[PDB]
Write an enzyme that holds these catalytic residues in place. Structure first.
Site, short mmCIF file in Angstrom:
data_model
loop_
_atom_site.label_atom_id
_atom_site.label_comp_id
_atom_site.label_asym_id
_atom_site.label_seq_id
_atom_site.Cartn_x
_atom_site.Cartn_y
_atom_site.Cartn_z
NE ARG A 1 -3.87 0.92 1.13
CZ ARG A 1 -4.76 1.77 1.63
NH1 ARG A 1 -5.28 1.57 2.82
NH2 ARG A 1 -5.14 2.82 0.91
CG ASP A 40 -4.12 1.94 7.72
OD1 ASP A 40 -3.72 1.58 6.58
OD2 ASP A 40 -5.08 2.72 7.92
NE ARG A 53 -9.05 10.63 3.30
CZ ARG A 53 -8.77 9.35 3.51
NH1 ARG A 53 -7.60 8.85 3.17
NH2 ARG A 53 -9.68 8.57 4.08
CE1 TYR A 70 -5.49 6.14 0.57
CE2 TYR A 70 -3.28 6.70 1.32
CZ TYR A 70 -4.65 6.63 1.55
OH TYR A 70 -5.15 7.03 2.80
#
Length: 363
Positions: A18, A43, A226, A328
């Site tokens: 990621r 995460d 964002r 992403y």
């Protein structure tokens, strides 16, 4: 597209990748990075940061671990969420967030997160080797103007920029204790000494802003950030190197991001041969909503022809994102070449988008 980091075939036997990053170097070398999410998509897990480097314009790649976590906790130690820049000396800087306990970095604690730090490495040989990790937050010697109510902060996830006089500017995101709640905001940090020390700017006008990048335009900073649960990427402009911000209408609200939370994306400047300055943004259209984050797309604005509406140039990843973690992306533009890296069903993929830049450049 080339699978740059492959969850089913990699040297670390990592189950997932990621948060990709890319820098096109002045000499044609391609340097990229990714979280090595060894144990799965989470995460809050055990993570190091890989590099992948190419000297044949993306045909083949050499892999390495660019930065290791603090190795304190075999479940939760992590360095992650790369933000990078190439300075005018050619030095490559990477800044990452570092933790070693379960729980969201911004929301878990009401005081400064005790296992949190920001770690820096740099390379003076075009990404062949890296410095030792430099801890930017263990003391007050590296970053000026950190707020006393900081819960934590890290880079904006993407690339920084260099101003006209060589000043380095990195996008950042911060969590702040305010009236018995934690609120998160975008901001920038900047260095006038090639990354040795930094000064933190002030927060942007709205909370729920996080991952972001800025471009430079005629001395101003313009940020595309964002903005969670608004449905769009916010945009702000600063004329004093990030001390004050106002809404930047030509981009604010123009890139829509679908229902639910926002998503990281990238935002860079190119100057076409007619001298116009254009902004390129990568982000999922998210037409299906929430964390599906389908259709990672590339958008264009012409800052010297602002009555022309933002244009969708192409969709490099015209697929649903994986709900476990996807969407992403990172653009890099250098010497009339344009590349992208992006998340693709637990892998990182790479594409050369230079033919789309040629279409835009109209030579």
């Amino acid at each position: 597209p080339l699978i740059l980091f492959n969850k089913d075939n990699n040297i670390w036997n990592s189950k997932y990748f990621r948060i990709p990053n890319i820098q096109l170097l002045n000499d044609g070398t391609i340097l990229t990075f990714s979280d090595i999410r060894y144990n799965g998509p989470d995460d809050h897990a055990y993570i190091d940061i890989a590099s992948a480097r190419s000297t044949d314009f993306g045909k083949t790649w050499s892999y390495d671990i660019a930065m290791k976590n603090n190795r304190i906790d075999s479940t939760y130690s992590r360095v992650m969420d790369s933000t990078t820049v190439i300075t005018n000396t050619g030095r490559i800087i990477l800044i990452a967030g570092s933790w070693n306990t379960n729980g969201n970095w911004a929301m878990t604690t009401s005081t400064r997160r005790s296992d949190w730090s920001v770690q820096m490495i740099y390379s003076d040989d075009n990404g062949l080797t890296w410095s030792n990790k430099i801890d930017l937050t263990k003391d007050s010697s590296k970053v000026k103007n950190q707020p006393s109510n900081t819960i934590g902060w890290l880079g904006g996830v993407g690339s920084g920029i260099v101003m006209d006089d060589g000043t380095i500017v990195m996008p950042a995101q911060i969590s702040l204790r305010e009236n018995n709640e934690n609120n998160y905001y975008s901001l920038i940090i900047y260095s006038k000494d090639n990354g040795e020390t930094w000064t933190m700017g002030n927060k942007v006008p709205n909370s729920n802003t996080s991952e972001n990048m800025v471009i430079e335009l005629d001395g101003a900073l313009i940020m595309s950030t964002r903005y969670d649960y608004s449905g769009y990427r916010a945009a702000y402009i600063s004329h004093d190197l990030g001390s004050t911000w106002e809404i930047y209408e030509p981009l604010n609200g123009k890139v829509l991001t679908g229902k639910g939370s926002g998503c990281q994306g990238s935002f860079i400047k190119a100057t076409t041969s007619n001298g116009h300055r254009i902004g390129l943004i990568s982000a999922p259209k998210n037409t299906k909503g929430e964390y599906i984050r389908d259709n990672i797309a590339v958008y264009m604005i012409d800052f010297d022809d602002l009555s022309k509406r933002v244009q969708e140039i192409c969709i490099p990843y015209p697929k649903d994102g994986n709900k476990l973690g996807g969407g992403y992306s990172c653009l890099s533009f250098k010497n009339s070449h344009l590349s992208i890296v992006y998340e693709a069903n637990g892998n990182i993929e790479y594409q050369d988008l230079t033919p789309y830049y040629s279409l835009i450049n109209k030579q």
